[PDB]
Structures are given as structure tokens and as C-alpha cells.
Design a protein around this ligand. Structure first.
Ligand SMILES: Cc1cc2nc3c(=O)[nH]c(=O)nc-3n(C[C@H](O)[C@H](O)[C@H](O)COP(=O)(O)O)c2cc1C
Ligand SMILES: Cc1cc2nc3c(=O)[nH]c(=O)nc-3n(C[C@H](O)[C@H](O)[C@H](O)COP(=O)(O)O)c2cc1C
Lengths: 209, 211
């Protein structure tokens, strides 16, 4: 039945991270409710997510100019092939769950490397400006932040959800939702309640996502 | 010698193959010609070691935060925590920053975020308050960005996320002056590519006389 990419960008586990704990409650409940679904954890700190580098440009340039994958160097093939797998896996899925901590207003670097690995002309978008191809998908972003960024002055500083929002628009993903676990550092006295309330929200959302 | 300038580039290709690096290079060559005494350091984020924050960095920070000496860090914790400290100290010690990036999917290459994560350090570039305040009150910065389409202006302005992010961080750090120079349109209107670039190079040269 449906394929769901549970995409995490956190080097810590659900015992040490508010985003991972919330995500964990979400995705556990999602599998409970949808036992038939293909739920794939993409762990961006365990998988190799190649940044686009000189080898990638050179490997791509070769393929572009008619060359065979055989003709790439070992490094070019390893990076290029990995990016192709990432790309293919993303298009093949039905639903996306991104889970991130807020670091300096946005997400860990590897979340940008993941987006770069799946943003591929002819797969997630096409030139026209551009139009998105992923017109039958859905996505959720679970984001943790020390202070409050969903409301108030700080909302103009929020840049991680804002970026993923732009990308979802770019890919033509028709349904996108934010679930924020926010304010636990600005209000340490309210940290457990903030967490638990976000968990309850996540488990409810998992019953219809 | 009198000011220290960090020329921070995030491109795998060089000034002969990249619009951003071509404009960056005209800028910095000229800046050096006009300010020969300034120390200008090229930080090429594709060649340098720019560690991402990972399990080892969290662990080693944690240790340091709990009152352990650096000596109690593992070898890999020391190398990564050490390196992040070098980057952080280097950033604070400079007087001016020049960021040079291509626009990839509305923003910059992943390594640019790693470098920002490396320098965004409490007690160095900002401090907490009873929110926060920037400490880089007497620094200055410039961002040169290249994009295939136009994102500085037009209805696509709302999609721009690279410059916007660095603007947020320069605000967070208290930097009172942050300028953008865009080289844009060259892929959307390929018959205008050479003129787009030559106008941006001339602008870069011009700016280098006052930066
Ligand atoms: C490197 C770094 C940068 C951070 N930057 C921010 C920030 O810009 N804004 C914020 O509110 N909290 C920031 N925090 C606090 C975390 O966002 C917060 O502790 C949150 O719970 C992180 O998600 P996690 O608990 O899933 O790790 C940062 C923490 C670290 C290590
Ligand atoms: C991986 C990748 C992603 C890109 N994403 C964007 C984008 O969002 N917007 C855009 O106008 N161009 C995009 N481009 C095109 C580059 O911005 C364009 O080639 C531009 O001239 C980049 O600057 P450079 O010339 O310094 O590389 C992308 C190119 C690549 C390889």
C-alpha cells in the first residue's frame, strides 16, 4: 500500500531530542493505524547523503555529454549513483515526514544535502518557470525549537520550515503541514508540557495522515 | 595588516566555470588592489575541513559543558570540537566577511550551512539575554549570489532563501552592514548571459573600492 519516507536529520536519538521524540510518537502511531504501509526511516546521519561537489559536477557533465556510467571514475560513480538512488526513492514514495531540530534558525546541513539530492528536473519538477511534478504526494514537517517561531516577532526569523515550504511549493506537493515543538528552552518550567502536548498532537495527526 | 577579511566561497567549481566565483574573484582582486595592507583569507568551503554537528560534537560539547577538561574528550571529539573552535575564533577575529554562493534550490550548498553552524557561537558572535544580542557590532559583510533566474525582485522574490537566511544570521550576529550583489537571469535569458555577468563584474569592482 502506501510508501512513507520518515526522514530524520538528527545525530541524536529520541531519548535526547524533542524533534526525534515527537517524530517517534508520530511514526509509531502511523504504523499502528496503517499496518500495511511501507514505512521507511531515512536516517540522514547514517545514510550517505553526498553533497554536490566537484566529482558530482564532473560525473554529471560526463553523462550529459553522452558518456556511459562505465566511464566515470570510482568516486564519480559512487556519488552520482547514490544521488540517483536518493532521487528515485523520493519520487517513488507517497508521503514525506521531515524531522529536524532548529539550528541557527534552520535545519542541519544534511537536510539541505537531502533536498539537493531529490530536486531533479524530470522527477520532482520541470521547466516551463517551473512546475512541480509531485501532485499526488503529502508531507509533514516536525520541527523543534528552543524559542517560539510559529507566532510573534520571531516568526520572521523562522527559516527551516519556510525553506521546506518553498520546496514543497516548488515540487508541487499539494498538502504540507508543520508540527512544531517549540518554546521548551525559553520556558524550561513548561518543557515537559510542551513536549507532551506536541506528542499528543502528533499521535492524533497520525490517525489521518 | 590593518583590516582582516574572510573571503568565504561555497562552490566546487572555480572563477572560470561559475558566475558567482567569477564575480567574487573580480570583487576580491580589486579589494586587494585598493587595500593592499589588509589580510585577505580565502576560505574555500569545498576544500577545507568544515565539520557538521554530529554525535561526537554533541558528546564533546556536553563533556566540556559538564566541567570536564578537553583532555577527557575522545580523539574524534577533540578533532571535531577543536576544528569548530578554530573556525569560530577565526570568524570573530576578522573585520569583514564576503560570502560567495551559487543558488541551489533557492538556497546555498549544504556546506554553507555547516560553516554558519560552525561560527554561530554563544559568547563569540551572539550572547543570550534575559532573547539574544549580537556581538559583531563593528563588523561588515557582503554576499555575492548567482542564480539562473531572477530572485532579487519580481514575484519570485518570495522564494529567495539563501540571501534571506544570511540576512537573518547577520542580524542575529549584530552586524550593522550587510550588502547583497546578485548575478541573476543568465539561465532564464541565455542570450543576455554575457552582459549580465559583465555588469555584475563591473558592479563588484565598483563596490570593492568602498567596502
Ligand atoms: C547549534 C544549535 C543551534 C541552535 N539554534 C537555535 C535557534 O536558532 N533558535 C532556537 O530557538 N533554538 C536553537 N537551538 C536550541 C534547539 O533548537 C532546541 O534545543 C530544540 O529542542 C532542538 O531540537 P531537538 O531537541 O530535537 O534537538 C539550537 C541548538 C543548537 C546546538
Ligand atoms: C543542484 C542545482 C540546483 C540549482 N538550483 C537552482 C535554483 O533554485 N534557482 C536557480 O535560479 N538556479 C538553480 N540552479 C542553477 C544555478 O543557479 C545556475 O547554474 C547559476 O548560474 C549558479 O551560479 P554559478 O554560476 O555560480 O554556479 C541550480 C543548479 C544546480 C546544479
Amino acid at each position: 500500500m502506501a510508501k512513507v519516507l520518515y526522514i530524520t536529520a538528527h545525530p541524536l536519538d529520541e531519548t535526547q531530542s524533542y524533534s526525534m521524540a515527537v517524530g517517534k510518537a508520530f511514526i509509531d502511531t502511523y504504523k499502528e493505524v496503517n499496518p500495511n504501509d511501507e514505512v521507511i526511516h531515512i536516517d540522514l546521519y547514517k545514510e550517505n547523503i553526498p553533497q554536490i561537489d566537484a566529482d558530482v559536477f564532473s560525473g554529471w557533465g560526463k553523462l550529459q555529454s553522452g558518456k556511459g556510467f562505465e566511464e566515470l571514475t570510482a568516486e564519480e560513480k559512487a556519488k552520482v549513483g547514490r544521488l540517483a538512488e536518493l532521487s528515485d526513492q523520493f519520487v517513488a514514495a507517497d508521503k514525506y515526514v521531515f524531522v529536524t531540530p532548529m539550528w541557527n534558525f534552520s535545519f542541519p546541513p544534511v537536510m539541505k544535502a537531502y533536498i539537493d539530492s531529490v530536486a531533479v528536473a524530470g522527477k520532482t519538477f520541470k521547466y516551463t518557470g517551473s512546475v512541480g511534478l509531485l501532485t499526488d504526494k503529502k508531507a509533514l514537517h516536525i520541527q523543534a525549537s528552543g524559542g517560539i517561531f510559529s507566532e510573534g516577532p520571531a516568526a520572521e526569523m523562522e527559516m527551516g520550515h519556510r525553506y521546506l515550504q518553498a520546496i514543497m511549493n516548488f515540487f508541487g506537493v499539494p498538502s504540507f503541514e508543520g508540527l512544531f515543538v517549540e518554546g521548551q528552552n525559553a520556558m524550561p518550567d513548561k518543557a515537559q508540557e510542551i513536549k507532551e502536548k506536541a506528542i499528543a498532537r502528533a499521535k492524533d495527526l497520525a490517525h489521518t495522515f
